[PDB]
Write a protein that binds this ligand. Sequence first.
Ligand code: ADP
Ligand code: ADP
Ligand code: MG
Lengths: 385, 384
Amino acid sequence: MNVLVIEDDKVFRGLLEEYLSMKGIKVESAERGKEAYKLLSEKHFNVVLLDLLLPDVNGLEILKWIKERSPETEVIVITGHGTIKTAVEAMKMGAYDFLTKPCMLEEIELTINKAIEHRKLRKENELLRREKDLKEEEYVFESPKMKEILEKIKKISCAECPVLITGESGVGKEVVARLIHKLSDRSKEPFVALNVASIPRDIFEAELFGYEKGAFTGAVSSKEGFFELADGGTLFLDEIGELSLEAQAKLLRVIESGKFYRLGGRKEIEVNVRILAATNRNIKELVKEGKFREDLYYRLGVIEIEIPPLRERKEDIIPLANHFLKKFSRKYAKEVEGFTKSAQELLLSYPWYGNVRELKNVIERAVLFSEGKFIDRGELSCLVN
Amino acid sequence: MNVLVIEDDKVFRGLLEEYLSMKGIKVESAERGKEAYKLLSEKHFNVVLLDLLLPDVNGLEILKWIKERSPETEVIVITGHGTIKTAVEAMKMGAYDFLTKPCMLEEIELTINKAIEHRKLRKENELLRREKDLKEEEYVFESPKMKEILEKIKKISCAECPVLITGESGVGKEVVARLIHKLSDRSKEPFVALNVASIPRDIFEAELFGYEKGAFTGAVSSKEGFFELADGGTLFLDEIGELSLEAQAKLLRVIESGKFYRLGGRKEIEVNVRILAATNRNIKELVKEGKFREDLYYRLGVIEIEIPPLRERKEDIIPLANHFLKKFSRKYAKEVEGFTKSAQELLLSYPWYGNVRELKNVIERAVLFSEGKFIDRGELSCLV
Ligand SMILES: Nc1ncnc2c1ncn2[C@@H]1O[C@H](COP(=O)(O)OP(=O)(O)O)[C@@H](O)[C@H]1O
Ligand SMILES: Nc1ncnc2c1ncn2[C@@H]1O[C@H](COP(=O)(O)OP(=O)(O)O)[C@@H](O)[C@H]1O
Ligand SMILES: [Mg+2]
């Protein structure tokens, strides 16, 4: 980490230089504005200690210069006694915190550490989000059945009640839930996808609801749960039919009161989370067999979206295939432009029991083994029909 | 959001209540320490303004109770003028910040906002991190070939120099980069994976190194790149061959001095990032064709690990196949639990030129198609 100190006071300045020097942080100093601007033009800094009062320039201008160029640089303004208004103005202008010249070295340490933590937290947030953005995909709804399902999704998006998405696996259930959140008034809020079937039943509740210290053996400290962390957002539970009966009851409560207890808790907690659920099974049968609460089935089933197989929407097949063609043609550095005229026929003729997920895997393999500029019916031969 | 105000001074408690009101934040009050304790036992507050000087109790006492019970709670301490020393110790115990009774309403706003931002970033990061842990895979390393590579990795992760991972596609080069990271000294630091081919070249250089205003059409601001974001951690560049000659030059310098300039930049940046690269191609070739710099090639290959194809690691095939069947079976709630003997023999005899990725993709489709308890030779034979 690099720090830039812009102070005129040889005393206070040195104190700063020393402190930073002691913590193992690279430092550079500037006695005046013209020198600070020079350095600021040659080196990127993580933290800048700026004194609002400088001989040749008005500190505030430097702060403004810094904030326009690199908002990622934490900036701490330095001001004297009784100059709190400008410090507050400075902060309103983008300064993170401020130091009063003079002050305890402990104040210097705490203020600088607070700024360092913010930066740490800020970078982590950016990285995880940018990493997530890399995986963003664009969807295809060119079939009548889907074209209208899209419209219904637009109508239910801003509702606060739950949606139950059904259909054969690999049909696009999670995709639909993503759009529901994307088109809703919560879109900028978190979207959490949790597959109930793949997460260990014995860990699921602790993760969804969170737990207090000692609620179960192993629980050394207290941990928040997805419901809390996703507060204000949307929670998507895939394969809802695999929820334990114990878990089903707790879920019905949140859907009813938006309140719940952590495992081993006494304080009731409230959250505002839209719940979206999906299943590729027969829940009605699950209710009869007494494995799935009928009440929950009724509530989740208020708004229901049914996604039909790929077989029942051939208008989607080719478009989706082209989408995947391009996608993988990139990921794997290959020269596949499109599909042979006959190859397209095979695609349309196949039943795609795996549906879109199958369609995806097939094209990805076809593209990975592709030699020419096109994919023949023969290249789909070994892969499907 | 729930906040709890614990102030005895009637005027200051009014300001805090007003500000919290202006913001639309649910508020609750206490004038004496013991009243605070009751409320604190009833509700889970997100932020607490705690005055240090209370008639019956000492603020510090409540501070320690909160930091221990619910650490999740942001605590802002209050204190009179010229009493800084008590506030400093307060922060030394877990208090996020402090206010000075009295002060501008704006001062209260800025401080409270910073505490709300701190909580927001904390929870967002915990969430994004946990959504990632959810996608962690268990890795299968049974063959003796992979067994010894695992051993080599261990001796490597303790070094800081770059590593060039080579091997056919779908062989597990990225899986290996991750293990190198987990076993290294920067395991707790970030690991950033980027596939140079999957991203259009123009968008790539900007993303990796960042850019300064004017670097290209519309770049209205200066932006950090993945290199800065991965600082202190590890960066994995897959399909390293697709790097533009310009990108190669910047990478070279970062490997030599940890310094570089953003795209169209003049404000030097310095990072400490371990570099791991992968390729299924022959760099030596690309060098002669003048497509890849020779010096970078040598710097990246200081340590070079070749990950063999599946057909040369037959011991991994059944273990891999079983792992995948189990994984996709749970994912789709299927009743499949294994492969018939005839199925197993096919998996072992098929050459898997697409390697592990091809195996994974084929088992996924087999599970999607299945409706029984086992996958037979017929379901596989049509897939391969
Ligand atoms: N309309 C679509 N447009 C683009 N891709 C889609 C579409 N529908 C599904 N997919 C892709 O097909 C695969 C099946 O996805 P998914 O929604 O998870 O199905 P399901 O939840 O029913 O098992 C995913 O990789 C997804 O990105
Ligand atoms: N040893 C392993 N155990 C379990 N899964 C593996 C293993 N090796 C690779 N995989 C999986 O195989 C696929 C190929 O992955 P990857 O590392 O990206 O290959 P490569 O980088 O060589 O192209 C991935 O989805 C990965 O999770
Ligand atoms: Mg690869």
